[PDB]
Scaffold this motif. Structure first.
Motif, PDB file in Angstrom:
ATOM      1  N   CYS A 188       0.858  -1.190   0.000  1.00 13.49           N
ATOM      2  CA  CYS A 188       0.000   0.000   0.000  1.00 13.49           C
ATOM      3  C   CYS A 188       0.888   1.233   0.000  1.00 13.49           C
ATOM      4  O   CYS A 188       2.085   1.108   0.117  1.00 13.49           O
ATOM      5  CB  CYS A 188      -0.933   0.027   1.195  1.00 13.49           C
ATOM      6  SG  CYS A 188      -0.032   0.100   2.766  1.00 13.49           S
ATOM      7  N   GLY A 189       0.268   2.401  -0.018  1.00 11.66           N
ATOM      8  CA  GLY A 189       1.072   3.627  -0.202  1.00 11.66           C
ATOM      9  C   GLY A 189       1.477   4.459   0.999  1.00 11.66           C
ATOM     10  O   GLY A 189       2.148   5.507   0.833  1.00 11.66           O
ATOM     11  N   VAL A 233      -3.809  -2.752  -8.692  1.00  7.28           N
ATOM     12  CA  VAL A 233      -3.061  -1.588  -9.202  1.00  7.28           C
ATOM     13  C   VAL A 233      -2.296  -1.624 -10.547  1.00  7.28           C
ATOM     14  O   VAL A 233      -2.221  -0.572 -11.220  1.00  7.28           O
ATOM     15  CB  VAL A 233      -2.076  -1.122  -8.095  1.00  7.28           C
ATOM     16  CG1 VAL A 233      -2.815  -0.979  -6.737  1.00  7.28           C
ATOM     17  CG2 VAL A 233      -0.929  -2.072  -7.934  1.00  7.28           C
ATOM     18  N   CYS A 254      -8.112  -7.824 -10.458  1.00  3.99           N
ATOM     19  CA  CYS A 254      -9.238  -7.031  -9.997  1.00  3.99           C
ATOM     20  C   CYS A 254      -9.281  -5.677 -10.668  1.00  3.99           C
ATOM     21  O   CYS A 254     -10.282  -5.295 -11.237  1.00  3.99           O
ATOM     22  CB  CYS A 254      -9.165  -6.891  -8.461  1.00  3.99           C
ATOM     23  SG  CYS A 254     -10.640  -6.107  -7.804  1.00  3.99           S
ATOM     24  N   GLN A 256      -6.510  -2.162 -12.287  1.00  5.56           N
ATOM     25  CA  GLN A 256      -5.142  -1.681 -12.618  1.00  5.56           C
ATOM     26  C   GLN A 256      -5.160  -0.172 -12.431  1.00  5.56           C
ATOM     27  O   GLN A 256      -4.804   0.617 -13.349  1.00  5.56           O
ATOM     28  CB  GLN A 256      -4.856  -2.005 -14.091  1.00  5.56           C
ATOM     29  CG  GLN A 256      -4.957  -3.462 -14.398  1.00  5.56           C
ATOM     30  CD  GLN A 256      -3.662  -4.217 -14.058  1.00  5.56           C
ATOM     31  OE1 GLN A 256      -2.715  -4.287 -14.868  1.00  5.56           O
ATOM     32  NE2 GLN A 256      -3.601  -4.763 -12.861  1.00  5.56           N
ATOM     33  N   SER A 258      -3.276   2.106 -11.300  1.00  3.22           N
ATOM     34  CA  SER A 258      -2.135   3.001 -11.619  1.00  3.22           C
ATOM     35  C   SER A 258      -2.181   3.427 -13.094  1.00  3.22           C
ATOM     36  O   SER A 258      -1.459   4.375 -13.480  1.00  3.22           O
ATOM     37  CB  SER A 258      -0.811   2.269 -11.276  1.00  3.22           C
ATOM     38  OG  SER A 258      -0.545   1.200 -12.186  1.00  3.22           O
ATOM     39  N   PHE A 288     -11.214 -10.236 -14.815  1.00  4.20           N
ATOM     40  CA  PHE A 288     -12.215 -10.572 -13.801  1.00  4.20           C
ATOM     41  C   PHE A 288     -13.119  -9.355 -13.665  1.00  4.20           C
ATOM     42  O   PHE A 288     -12.672  -8.232 -13.336  1.00  4.20           O
ATOM     43  CB  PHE A 288     -11.602 -10.845 -12.439  1.00  4.20           C
ATOM     44  CG  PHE A 288     -12.649 -11.103 -11.387  1.00  4.20           C
ATOM     45  CD1 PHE A 288     -13.401 -12.250 -11.397  1.00  4.20           C
ATOM     46  CD2 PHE A 288     -12.973 -10.125 -10.469  1.00  4.20           C
ATOM     47  CE1 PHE A 288     -14.479 -12.438 -10.525  1.00  4.20           C
ATOM     48  CE2 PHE A 288     -14.044 -10.301  -9.586  1.00  4.20           C
ATOM     49  CZ  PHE A 288     -14.817 -11.454  -9.607  1.00  4.20           C
ATOM     50  N   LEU A 289     -14.393  -9.525 -13.997  1.00  5.34           N
ATOM     51  CA  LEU A 289     -15.337  -8.419 -13.907  1.00  5.34           C
ATOM     52  C   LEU A 289     -16.435  -8.959 -13.035  1.00  5.34           C
ATOM     53  O   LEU A 289     -17.080  -9.953 -13.372  1.00  5.34           O
ATOM     54  CB  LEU A 289     -15.909  -8.064 -15.280  1.00  5.34           C
ATOM     55  CG  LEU A 289     -17.020  -7.063 -15.318  1.00  5.34           C
ATOM     56  CD1 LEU A 289     -16.569  -5.699 -14.810  1.00  5.34           C
ATOM     57  CD2 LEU A 289     -17.502  -6.935 -16.799  1.00  5.34           C
ATOM     58  N   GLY A 336      -5.185   8.060  -2.854  1.00  4.51           N
ATOM     59  CA  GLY A 336      -4.818   7.463  -1.595  1.00  4.51           C
ATOM     60  C   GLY A 336      -5.262   8.006  -0.233  1.00  4.51           C
ATOM     61  O   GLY A 336      -4.771   7.555   0.794  1.00  4.51           O
TER      62      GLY A 336
HETATM   63  N1  LIG Z   1     -13.122  -6.286 -11.335  1.00  4.21           N
HETATM   64  C1  LIG Z   1     -14.225  -5.706 -10.853  1.00  4.21           C
HETATM   65  O1  LIG Z   1     -15.375  -6.063 -11.045  1.00  4.21           O
HETATM   66  C2  LIG Z   1     -13.888  -4.594  -9.918  1.00  4.21           C
HETATM   67  C3  LIG Z   1     -14.878  -4.121  -9.060  1.00  4.21           C
HETATM   68  C4  LIG Z   1     -14.605  -3.041  -8.107  1.00  4.21           C
HETATM   69  C5  LIG Z   1     -13.331  -2.457  -8.056  1.00  4.21           C
HETATM   70  N2  LIG Z   1     -12.396  -2.967  -8.931  1.00  4.21           N
HETATM   71  C6  LIG Z   1     -11.014  -2.425  -8.968  1.00  4.21           C
HETATM   72  O2  LIG Z   1     -10.409  -2.721  -7.722  1.00  4.21           O
HETATM   73  C7  LIG Z   1      -9.297  -1.550  -7.453  1.00  4.21           C
HETATM   74  C8  LIG Z   1      -9.614  -1.108  -6.005  1.00  4.21           C
HETATM   75  O3  LIG Z   1     -10.953  -0.507  -6.159  1.00  4.21           O
HETATM   76  P1  LIG Z   1     -11.531   0.000  -4.679  1.00  4.21           P
HETATM   77  O4  LIG Z   1     -12.813   0.469  -4.920  1.00  4.21           O
HETATM   78  O5  LIG Z   1     -11.116  -0.855  -3.645  1.00  4.21           O
HETATM   79  O6  LIG Z   1     -10.712   1.434  -4.463  1.00  4.21           O
HETATM   80  P2  LIG Z   1      -9.662   1.625  -3.217  1.00  4.21           P
HETATM   81  O7  LIG Z   1      -8.582   0.629  -3.226  1.00  4.21           O
HETATM   82  O8  LIG Z   1     -10.476   1.858  -2.016  1.00  4.21           O
HETATM   83  O9  LIG Z   1      -9.167   3.100  -3.470  1.00  4.21           O
HETATM   84  C9  LIG Z   1      -8.227   3.228  -4.572  1.00  4.21           C
HETATM   85  C10 LIG Z   1      -6.727   3.114  -3.864  1.00  4.21           C
HETATM   86  O10 LIG Z   1      -5.758   2.926  -4.967  1.00  4.21           O
HETATM   87  C11 LIG Z   1      -4.486   3.270  -4.559  1.00  4.21           C
HETATM   88  N3  LIG Z   1      -3.807   3.908  -5.700  1.00  4.21           N
HETATM   89  C12 LIG Z   1      -4.233   4.986  -6.398  1.00  4.21           C
HETATM   90  N4  LIG Z   1      -3.404   5.372  -7.419  1.00  4.21           N
HETATM   91  C13 LIG Z   1      -2.452   4.484  -7.298  1.00  4.21           C
HETATM   92  C14 LIG Z   1      -1.167   4.228  -8.059  1.00  4.21           C
HETATM   93  N5  LIG Z   1      -0.848   5.097  -9.147  1.00  4.21           N
HETATM   94  N6  LIG Z   1      -0.405   3.199  -7.642  1.00  4.21           N
HETATM   95  C15 LIG Z   1      -0.558   2.346  -6.704  1.00  4.21           C
HETATM   96  N7  LIG Z   1      -1.793   2.521  -5.943  1.00  4.21           N
HETATM   97  C16 LIG Z   1      -2.583   3.463  -6.227  1.00  4.21           C
HETATM   98  C17 LIG Z   1      -4.608   4.255  -3.342  1.00  4.21           C
HETATM   99  O11 LIG Z   1      -4.083   3.695  -2.173  1.00  4.21           O
HETATM  100  P3  LIG Z   1      -2.477   3.705  -1.868  1.00  4.21           P
HETATM  101  O12 LIG Z   1      -2.312   4.714  -0.788  1.00  4.21           O
HETATM  102  O13 LIG Z   1      -2.152   2.360  -1.386  1.00  4.21           O
HETATM  103  O14 LIG Z   1      -1.811   4.147  -3.186  1.00  4.21           O
HETATM  104  C18 LIG Z   1      -6.201   4.449  -3.122  1.00  4.21           C
HETATM  105  O15 LIG Z   1      -6.632   4.584  -1.881  1.00  4.21           O
HETATM  106  C19 LIG Z   1      -9.495  -0.633  -8.615  1.00  4.21           C
HETATM  107  O16 LIG Z   1      -8.397  -1.022  -9.549  1.00  4.21           O
HETATM  108  C20 LIG Z   1     -10.962  -0.943  -9.229  1.00  4.21           C
HETATM  109  O17 LIG Z   1     -10.989  -0.545 -10.556  1.00  4.21           O
HETATM  110  C21 LIG Z   1     -12.653  -4.059  -9.897  1.00  4.21           C
END
Ligand SMILES: NC(=O)c1ccc[n+]([C@@H]2O[C@H](COP(=O)([O-])OP(=O)(O)OC[C@H]3O[C@@H](n4cnc5c(N)ncnc54)[C@H](OP(=O)(O)O)[C@@H]3O)[C@@H](O)[C@H]2O)c1
Ligand SMILES: CCCCCC(=O)/C=C/[C@@H]1[C@H](O)CC(=O)[C@H]1C/C=C/CCCC(=O)O
Length: 351
Positions: A188-189, A233, A254, A256, A258, A288-289, A336
């Motif tokens: 994490c960051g 990420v 899940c 990407q 970044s 995976f969607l 973040g």
């Molecule tokens: N496949 C699906 O059906 C599905 C469904 C829902 C969400 N998702 C995906 O799951 C991921 C997490 O979604 P979430 O809702 O749980 O949001 P989240 O993790 O609560 O919030 C996004 C987090 O990403 C990190 N981040 C942002 N820019 C970054 C970078 N350039 N490099 C590295 N880390 C970075 C930040 O934490 P840090 O401080 O750690 O950087 C931030 O808090 C996303 O990629 C989203 O698109 C996929």
């Protein structure tokens, strides 16, 4: 005509740009005094902001499953609210309801058929959990691990989770332990996030990618390599993780995040050198969607609720207040500011 506040898309940052609070604008509109048969009037209580919204800010989202937001029109997304008035034969005043298409507006008249009634007891009254761990993000983590992780109780596998302190990641690492992984390491960051991962969420180790040598820390915390990578990420962090993934391992792809402020198609391909590793080690990386598994949503929510009620699943969220802060909340989450699920509290008026 009551006055309500709403948020509209003020400007697009461009497919290759960074989102800012000012891409959104808050204005006032008058609400109908008029509620038609089949309609309800709801008071918005909580709204979600999520990474997938970054593509809705583009003119073209990239896929058929999500439509672009329109300039000068009200924005929408996951929300929870209370019914204040109903002329819909199957909804009552005081009912709590949700929609994936809730307008960013303080009070709204909606077609009752576009809403789903929620059961507060599943979340011990924390309605905002329906937008998170007992909602789409938690379902994404659970179904993703069940369908793509290939974990069995007793196999003593090591799981690395990127975006580990976010909504999906914080839940994914816990589920990893529930389902059989012996070691769960999060990346994490921030230092504070690292502390929470190991002190409250049961992770075995935490890596700060901004301050640590990630490869060095992966070698220390994952002494037997990485068998499952729950990836939120992409980018360089994933390239580093994949370099230490074992034979026949699995990447749960899940998200990407970044790469979301770039025009690369999703999911971005791996560089030749990293793809060479993937091919040589037979590492699986499939899309995976979560919407491709709606028949697993109900049992999933019940399982997530049960783990929470059993005192096993720890649910983390970050709250920002006020509809005027939706844009700021989206910008904060993307960069973040959040631990766990980012939520915006619009109102607590429930009586
Ligand atoms: N496949 C699906 O059906 C599905 C469904 C829902 C969400 N998702 C995906 O799951 C991921 C997490 O979604 P979430 O809702 O749980 O949001 P989240 O993790 O609560 O919030 C996004 C987090 O990403 C990190 N981040 C942002 N820019 C970054 C970078 N350039 N490099 C590295 N880390 C970075 C930040 O934490 P840090 O401080 O750690 O950087 C931030 O808090 C996303 O990629 C989203 O698109 C996929
Ligand atoms: C990548 C990523 O982060 C995807 C988010 C998804 C979400 O979990 C489910 C999907 O549709 C994406 C967007 C949000 C919800 C609206 C679609 C509702 C439906 O079409 O049933």
């Amino acid at each position: 005509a009551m006055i309500v506040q709403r948020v509209v898309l003020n400007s697009r940052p461009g497919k290759n740009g960074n989102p800012v609070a000012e891409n959104f604008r808050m204005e006032e509109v008058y609400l109908p005094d008029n509620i038609n048969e089949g309609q309800v009037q709801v008071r918005t209580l909580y709204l979600s902001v999520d990474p997938y919204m970054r593509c809705r800010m583009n003119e073209d989202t990239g896929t058929d499953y999500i439509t672009p937001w329109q300039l000068s029109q009200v924005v929408d997304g996951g929300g929870i609210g209370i019914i204040e008035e109903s002329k819909h034969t199957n909804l009552t005043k005081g009912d709590f309801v949700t929609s994936f298409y809730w307008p960013w507006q303080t009070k709204v008249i909606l077609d009752g058929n576009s809403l789903e009634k929620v059961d507060p007891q599943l979340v011990d009254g924390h309605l905002s959990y329906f937008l998170g761990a007992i909602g789409m993000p938690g379902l994404t983590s659970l179904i993703g691990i069940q369908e793509k992780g290939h974990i069995t109780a007793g196999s003593n596998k090591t799981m690395v989770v990127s975006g580990a302190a976010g909504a999906c990641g914080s839940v994914a690492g816990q589920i990893g332990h529930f389902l059989g992984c012996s070691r769960v390491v999060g990346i994490c960051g921030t230092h504070e996030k690292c502390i929470l991962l190991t002190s409250e969420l049961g992770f075995d180790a935490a890596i700060n990618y901004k301050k640590d040598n990630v490869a060095e820390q992966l070698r220390e915390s994952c002494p037997a390599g990485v068998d499952v990578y729950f990836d939120n990420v992409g980018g360089n962090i994933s390239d580093t993780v994949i370099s230490q993934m074992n034979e026949n391992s699995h990447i749960i792809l899940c998200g990407q995040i970044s790469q979301y402020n770039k025009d690369v198609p999703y999911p971005p391909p791996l560089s030749p050198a990293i793809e060479a590793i993937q091919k040589e080690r037979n590492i699986t990386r499939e899309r995976f969607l979560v919407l491709n598994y709606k028949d697993k949503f109900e049992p999933g929510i019940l399982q997530l609720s049960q783990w929470f009620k059993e005192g096993k699943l720890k649910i983390k969220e970050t709250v920002i207040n006020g509809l005027e802060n939706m844009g700021a909340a989206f910008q904060s989450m993307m960069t973040g500011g959040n631990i766990g699920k980012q939520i915006v509290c619009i109102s607590e008026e429930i009586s």
